């Protein structure tokens, strides 16, 4: 899709293997903010957003949090607290064409900046002058959408680049996109180290009389630590008691 009308893809209710994506050497730029790429195989997230577009090869540095320029300022602005990954690879031999390709357009003129994660497909004529444009091209009334015009023979600074942005929501919620890790039978009344949906800990899992609401998942104490969990496979509630300890 064009950079000014980028599509958004939903990923949920499946198991994803980020190892097969990371090991590929085709990608030229691969930057993950907030999460280490090699550890994505263990965490389980609640939802994945995928965004895809094509930009100029030299100007691929602009798609990053807290950046200023043309596309970031006017077409696609990333949030300042981004927690996700950005992948960008050369696509000269797939999107460029001899004699000029005009299937891709990019916005240039707008009155105000763009809020993060907002897509605009407005086609109104820019009004750079006091006179009304009346939907007629002319003085101070230009078409806001022009094409890049990719060609195979230009330098590195003009080849098209394909960019895909993956974003996760790290909010505590019922998780549905887990990594490929096999489950293990659970043991009660013994000091074990547990991993529930990516959250790790140590302690003893015991039976509980706590009445969670059907939508209610985790319980916390004063110190923000976890106190009771619900097993994802079997809808039971387990209290977590720290292992015995003491000075000698």
């Amino acid at each position: 899709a064009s950079v000014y009308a980028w599509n958004r893809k939903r990923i949920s209710n499946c198991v994803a293997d980020y190892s097969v994506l990371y090991n590929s050497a085709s990608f030229s730029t691969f930057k993950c903010y907030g999460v280490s790429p090699t550890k994505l195989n263990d965490l389980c997230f609640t939802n994945v957003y995928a965004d895809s577009f094509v930009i100029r090869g030299d100007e691929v540095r602009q798609i990053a949090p807290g950046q200023t320029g043309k596309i970031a300022d006017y077409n696609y602005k990333l949030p300042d607290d981004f927690t996700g990954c950005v992948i960008a690879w050369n696509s000269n031999n797939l999107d460029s064409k001899v004699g000029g390709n005009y299937n891709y357009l990019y916005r240039l003129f707008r009155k105000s900046n763009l809020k993060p994660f907002e897509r605009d497909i407005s086609t109104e004529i820019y009004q750079a002058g006091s006179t009304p444009c009346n939907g007629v091209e002319g003085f101070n009334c230009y078409f806001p959408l022009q094409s890049y015009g990719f060609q195979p023979t230009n330098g590195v600074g003009y080849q098209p680049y394909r960019v895909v942005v993956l974003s996760f929501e790290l909010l505590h919620a019922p998780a549905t996109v887990c990594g490929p890790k096999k489950s293990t039978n659970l043991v009660k009344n013994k000091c074990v180290n547990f991993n529930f949906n990516g959250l790790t800990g140590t302690g003893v899992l015991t039976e509980s009389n706590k009445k969670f609401l059907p939508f209610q998942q985790f319980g916390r104490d004063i110190a923000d630590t976890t106190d009771a969990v619900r097993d994802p496979q079997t809808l039971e509630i387990l209290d977590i008691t720290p292992c015995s300890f003491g000075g000698v």
Epitope: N92, N93, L94, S96, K97, V98, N101, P152
Partner: antibody, heavy 117, light 111 residues
Framework: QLVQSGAEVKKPGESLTISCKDS????????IGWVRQMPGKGLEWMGM????????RYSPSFEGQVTISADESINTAYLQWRSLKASDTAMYYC????????????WGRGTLVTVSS | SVLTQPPSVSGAPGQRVTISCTGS?????????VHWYQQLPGTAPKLLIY???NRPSGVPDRFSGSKSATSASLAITGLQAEDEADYYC????????????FGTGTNVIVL
């Protein structure tokens, strides 16, 4: 005009290599590739290579079975077989390919390969 | 994901003939052009129409074609005796699996 080799006959199990040469001075601009046609039926895409950055694309029905390479100095594409089978006898065309619009433009006369046991 | 195509048709010299190539939303949908190719008996083939609206050099003007959403068709006005050949309709696909997919093929008979 793209030149090629002749028609050859070989035993199954050996390795056969065909080559297609382009005389033009615009080799590393467009794509090159291969196509097969089984006698009596229509053709099917095989593989396609961009020599500018050695990009290689294959078809799912013809993955691993065959291998295709190319060189930017001699300006020639090689197609090599692992193990010839009795049912792979067909007519093979080296083809020049254009991008975006995804159509072929002009092809050579092709080559004929026969395998018998 | 091969494209559907009727086996063959017949025609008479001096009259218009028409052929069709039909597919699905995955192949011809989402705005994907269809190109046409020839097959002379025992001869290296040649292009007919690319981009569904343009036309190359060296081809007679008696050929035309257009697409209607899911289907596409071409017309020949005044077929002659040399039109004894095989015709192929080629399109693309959404994924990189179907970059180049061809139809089964169609043939015509004069008189």
């Amino acid at each position: 005009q793209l030149v090629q080799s002749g028609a050859e006959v070989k035993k199954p199990g050996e390795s056969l290599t065909i080559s297609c040469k382009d005389s033009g001075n615009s080799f590393t601009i467009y794509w090159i590739g291969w196509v097969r046609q089984m006698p009596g039926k229509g053709l099917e895409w095989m593989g396609m290579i961009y020599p500018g950055d050695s990009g290689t694309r294959y078809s799912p029905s013809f993955e691993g079975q065959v291998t295709i390479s190319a060189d930017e100095s001699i300006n020639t594409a090689y197609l090599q077989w692992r193990s010839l089978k009795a049912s792979d006898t067909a007519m093979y065309y080296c083809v020049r390919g254009i991008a975006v619009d995804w159509y072929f433009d002009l092809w050579g006369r092709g080559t004929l390969v026969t395998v018998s046991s | 994901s091969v494209l559907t195509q009727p086996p063959s048709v017949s025609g008479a010299p001096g009259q218009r003939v028409t052929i069709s190539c039909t597919g699905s939303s995955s192949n011809i949908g989402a705005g994907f052009d269809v190109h046409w190719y020839q097959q002379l008996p025992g001869t290296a083939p040649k292009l007919l129409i690319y981009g569904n609206n343009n036309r190359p050099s060296g081809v007679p003007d008696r050929f035309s074609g257009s697409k209607s959403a899911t289907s596409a068709s071409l017309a020949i006005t005044g077929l002659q005796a040399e039109d004894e050949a095989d015709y192929y309709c080629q399109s693309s696909d959404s994924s990189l699996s179907g970059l180049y997919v061809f139809g089964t093929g169609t043939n015509v008979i004069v008189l």
